[PDB]
């Protein structure tokens, strides 16, 4: 649409990294911030969801 | 530059500070108190077994045994995943 | 189709097998045109062993029971006097690419 | 009382506090919760090997202390 | 001594390594124990 | 097939290495550097009249030795973004003007600094 | 930095030959030096 | 008696803890210092610190003079034993200068290892003799009059080891055909220890091998009803396999 | 043009690191990397080299280099944690050469230059390692033709 | 005794730290001197600075003029040891000139690596002998009677590493078929270690393959009760899984 842009998975993951870490902690997919950072750097499918 | 503080490192340090107090409060009050009086934490200087045996008033063997028990309890894998990745 | 292979003495697809004029990537290209039929749902290991000079093709391969090659005239590689090729081609079943 | 029923269904068998015999007999079959044993009928636990009438009476008294009962009983 | 410590809360002679007794003047060398970023703000001068 | 491959052009950064002479991020793909927000970009944001986005792109997302860490903490902990401080490059400019024998002093409403 | 107590400080007064007087903060456990460099003119 | 070397100091911990010199016992004294001597002796020459000794001996709550009490017990042993045997190193107390075969536990372990080597080499009679000599070293109850929780743990460990040695000697005796004393020993231990199921399995093997069948099935039924009443599992696949081989009259076992 | 391997190319990238002799001590190329799990260093050689033909992705360990030591100022919290888990006596630092972000390839070659051997090296360094990673890039979105 | 080379100097750190010159022991000295020797040794001959040595020995609160204390400790080491074995580099000390097998920690590392290699190769007797040699190295608790936070950290690390060594050793023992000794010594260890879950799982699998079941599930029930009392949580799912597969009488383990 006119208000939409398509970002790649890696680029959007790198831009939104702290937001993804916070949401991973909130949705209890990671025990803490360090585990969320490790999951983000590894690049699993739950990180992309 | 290496002197620049990494935001991720500072966030991890603050989360460690918040998590260690919580896992100390998970233990009993007396065990958490003697651990916090034994290995730094609340007070910068770590008081030795002799230096805490006057304010609490037991033997060296009793305080050493309960310190070893607290170390073994904290070494159990149940209270490990909250602090293993903190290094 | 063939989904994975393993050449003896080769660790990755960027080396050259000692004694063939086509490198391993050209071998990947030649294997990728090999049309096969596999009755087994599980992957099947086919064996291709050639010693001495000659022209290794799809007719020289050993298809197990239930797996059949269909273009035996497809040339795979060439071998000089000191050439020796051993591949274990894994074949699987599916649709698309 | 719905939360009380959920709690009485949720706690493990270790809080049931009966002997090792019937506890082992029910844990062999795969029962690890009070609600799982409740959902089983009478013939379900009288088909258990090495489960005598004394075991049934002890279990019945145990759940009777907790205020709940068996299925079809 | 002039521009502040290059370390954090340390000083030149090696004494006063900890953080607790921050903001003191070392008697051996005169280095004030504070953060290293003080070197981004602290200047001196040359007499001609 | 040209050598403007997409695997080499793509680069992203949230927080990485920072420069030394001034505390802004450094540049480049291999060293995890940030994109440059030049003068014309700042003109475009003033033409929109978006003071807050411009301020956070100039003071929060670079050039602040304490704002960046506090903002990262606020994002990680979920709380609101703290107020921006003073960019470091302005302080470096003040220090370089002071060593050219210019008594450049900031003034508040009540007095000096 | 949250809960840290600074070592007790004493402000020791140094005066040079030129009349400049200044206070330097030292620790209580610290040994007070009789000699210092003047912040104003660099003299003894 | 053939190894009674002059001047050799020997120790006994497999029963009541004692010290012998030239065949004459030494005044061990108080049971508390006897427990300390046993704790030093049971580590097979490994050094023990004073604090771990206190924790092992007096449990969880020692009184206010634990260190001095341990020190004076060690001093009393120093007068009792040789000065060169009990030594102080790194704040702890250790037993050194121990000769080979003087300690009953070390001698029993060496004899058990030799018996295992002989069994691997096929020498059943030599292994039986060696481990019978090792089993003769047990002087009744392990650690008689020895207080402390570590004493209880060591009692359990050595009792289990002795029971397992009796178990393997029994199976070796069943394989050797000496079932006459084996039946009596197995009945006595099953009366003493109903809890062990491997021992009852060897008893069932002896019952089937010696030639009576119906009372062997009575023994199996007794084991089954005991298991059902106390614990309630089905019989284990090894026990069921032995029972069905016995019921089928397997000529390989006979 | 993707399935028939028409528009695709092999891209080989070289990337090197050197174990030097700094003031505190000599940097060591070693397998025993501290503060890392065993599965991360699974594909390393005995001396700490990724094997030839080992598929590697971003963030993976290529060659294991540790710095000898650093000014140590452990916090009481980290000191207490150290007591629970235990740490390496050496207290070396993780500065091993990792894969850059967003890179996938197959290791096709490693070159090692040793000062103790006859190989000539620049002053200061003790040994040097170069690793080549080769990827067969197909044609994708954004590729300029 | 077969590796007793002439001129070889041997060091002992896995227990009480000691120095051995050609078979005769040397007076190591004060406990802080012993801890300094241990700190200089465990770095495998790496140069440790004087300030770091102070931090290792004493921690956070050192006395002001006590760098000369470390100086005189190093001088006393050079008195006891060779002039050239301890070298001064960049203001610190390093114990160099150590041949292979000189340090017991390095010997334990090599023995563990060889045992892992033989596990990968499937050799049971060779790795069993290697681990038997490994377990005959440390005497008692590691670093006995030495102070310092570095000493405490090394103590707890080497104790944990010894725990995993015992776990792997006795898992291999259960793989080869050593029931009795494994059951006895793991009963002793779990009496000593009440909350070690891996050793208790080893007890479960050992007793499941040894013919003993009642005390196994009794120990398991005690484990759950103590883990709920002291921690308030559930044990690891692997223990529950292995207990469940024990309950169904799976003949795969037997
Ligand atoms: Zn100073």
Numbering used by the authors:
A (entry chain D): 437 to 485
B (entry chain F): 424 to 510
C (entry chain A): 50 to 146
D (entry chain K): 239 to 311
E (entry chain D): 50 to 97
F (entry chain C): 1017 to 1129
G (entry chain G): 19 to 62
H (entry chain J), J (entry chain I): 17 to 270
The authors write:
Streptomyces antibiotic regulatory proteins (SARPs) are widely distributed activators of antibiotic biosynthesis. Streptomyces coelicolor AfsR is an SARP regulator with an additional nucleotide-binding oligomerization domain (NOD) and a tetratricopeptide repeat (TPR) domain. AfsR null mutants show defects in afsS transcription, as well as production deficiencies in actinorhodin and undecylprodigiosin. It is presumed that upon binding of AfsR to a 22-base pair (bp) binding box (afs box), RNA polymerase (RNAP) holoenzyme is recruited to the afsS promoter, allowing for transcriptional initiation.
The DNA scaffold is engineered from the afsS promoter, consisting of a 44-bp (−50 to −7) upstream promoter double-stranded DNA (dsDNA) which contains the 22-bp afs box and the consensus –10 element, a 6-bp (−6 to −1) non-complementary transcription bubble, and a 15-bp (+1 to +15) downstream promoter dsDNA. SARP-TIC is an open complex containing a transcription bubble of 13 nt. ΣHrdB R4 is positioned on top of 2 SARP protomers, instead of binding in the major groove of the −35 element as observed in the reported structures, suggesting a sigma adaptation mechanism like M. smegmatis PafBC. The SARP-TIC structure elucidates the binding interactions between SARP protomers and 2 major grooves of the afs box, with each protomer making contacts with 1 DR.
